[PDB]
């Protein structure tokens, strides 16, 4: 039971790091599409002026 | 007039987006999935015991 | 044991439903950001045209 206590703490930590980098990669995809539409906007900007 | 054609197409693009956002907001899947995952977790606990 | 496999199968179906709803709301938040940047761009489009 004590063993399960410490390894439960460890797996909780593993979940914390997993979620912390999962949100990071999700934001990375968000920034990717952000750069895409910003490039489209810059295309329109060079076209207009 | 090229700019006005661009304005017109942007108008209908914005209208389509405004329709889609309203529809998917009316879907309201967040609360439904919250209930579903609560049921899932409790059923998982039942299967575990 | 039969109870076990039936429990596991129905909980797996519950998993599939939950994952479907989760990806639906993920696309919903993606569309939310879509609306955000699209209306931002539309503001500048109306500013010029």
Swiss-Prot record, chains A, C:
Subcellular location: Nucleus; Chromosome
Domain of life the protein comes from: Eukaryota
Family as reported in the entry's similarity comment: Belongs to the SMC family. RAD50 subfamily.
Subunit annotation: Component of the MRN complex composed of two heterodimers RAD50 and MRE11 associated with a single NBS1.
Domain notes: The zinc-hook, which separates the large intramolecular coiled coil regions, contains 2 Cys residues that coordinate one molecule of zinc with the help of the 2 Cys residues of the zinc-hook of another RAD50 molecule, thereby forming a V-shaped homodimer. The two heads of the homodimer, which constitute the ATP-binding domain, interact with the MRE11 homodimer.
Functional summary from the UniProt entry: Component of the MRN complex, which plays a central role in double-strand break (DSB) repair, DNA recombination, maintenance of telomere integrity and meiosis. The MRN complex is involved in the repair of DNA double-strand breaks (DSBs) via homologous recombination (HR), an error-free mechanism which primarily occurs during S and G2 phases. The complex (1) mediates the end resection of damaged DNA, which generates proper single-stranded DNA, a key initial steps in HR, and is (2) required for the recruitment of other repair factors and efficient activation of ATM and ATR upon DNA damage.
Protein name as it appears in the record: DNA repair protein RAD50
Gene behind this protein: RAD50
